[PDB]
Amino acid sequence: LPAHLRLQPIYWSRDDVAQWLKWAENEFSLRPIDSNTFEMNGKALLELTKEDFRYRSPHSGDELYELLQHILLGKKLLEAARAGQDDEVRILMANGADVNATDNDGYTPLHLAASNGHLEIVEVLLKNGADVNASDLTGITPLHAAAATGHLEIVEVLLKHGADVNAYDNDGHTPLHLAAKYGHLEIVEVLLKHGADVNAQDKFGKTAFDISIDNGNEDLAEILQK
Ligand SMILES: [Cl-]
Ligand SMILES: [Cl-]
Ligand SMILES: [Cl-]
Ligand SMILES: [Cl-]
Ligand SMILES: [K+]
Structure with missing residues (x-):
């Protein structure tokens, strides 16, 4: 993955800017432009106005400017979702921020609010079209994140909004496996009531029952047996 896709633009080097232009030409089917159309770094790109972009690129400048604003x-x-800043989230969405933006790890605002326990933000994102089943780079969904971090009310809201109870990540872990690993008994119970496959096996040959034993969560193993 190229640097410019992994960094915020204020950190882009001069070379990153050139690579971004070439990436955007292909991604957005734009008229080709010379790699030196913007002889500057990312911090400099952020100073230009839309009119400056249009001057430098008559065919694509407006698009390029708006792609940066999107990022x-x-x-x-x-960051507002991660930090639980309900007011900032509200302002950013009213200003058109992408509710399905992703960070360097593939995490969306919904992933971050779910992982950090911010129930009101989870609800507002879902009401406004956040993808309840978005999968980060390793296959983790918002439901995995809420289950792993012990946020029961968020688990419930995600399930009510259509979260896949049996989604599996790159290691074959479902939300149930993660709840078992971190000892979240009440979450295990909710997942089971919503159709979690108790017999799902991870890439290491282990079920949630095995994981619960391995992690000393004997109360969970009890619930999983019966
Ligand atoms: Cl700006
Ligand atoms: Cl955005
Ligand atoms: Cl399986
Ligand atoms: Cl599975
Ligand atoms: K994602």
Whole structure:
């Protein structure tokens, strides 16, 4: 994955800017432009106006400018969701921020609010079209994240909004496996009531029951047996 897709633009080097232009030409089917159309770094790109972009690229400048704004607003929303800043989330969405923006790990605002326990933000994102089943780079969904971190009310809201109870990540772990690993008995019970496959096996040959034993969560193993 190229640097410019892994960094916020304020950190892009001069070379990153050139690579971004070439990436955008292909991603957005734009008229080709010379790699030196913007002889500057990312911090400099952020100083230019839309009119400056249009001057430098008559065919694509407006698009390029708006792609950068999309990244900036997306990052503010990710950070506001992570930090539980309900008011900032509200302002950013009213300002058009992408509710399905992703960070360097594939985490969306919904992933971050779910992982950090911010129930009101989870609810507002879902009401406004956040993808309840978005999968990060390793296959983790918002439901995995809420289950692993012990946020029962969020688990319930995600399930009510259509979260896949049996989604599996790159290691074959379902939300049930993660709840078992971290000892979250009440979450295990909710997942089971919503159709979690108690017999799902991870890439290491283990079920949730095995994981619960391995982690000393004997109360969970009890619930899983019966
Ligand atoms: Cl700006
Ligand atoms: Cl955005
Ligand atoms: Cl399985
Ligand atoms: Cl599975
Ligand atoms: K994602």
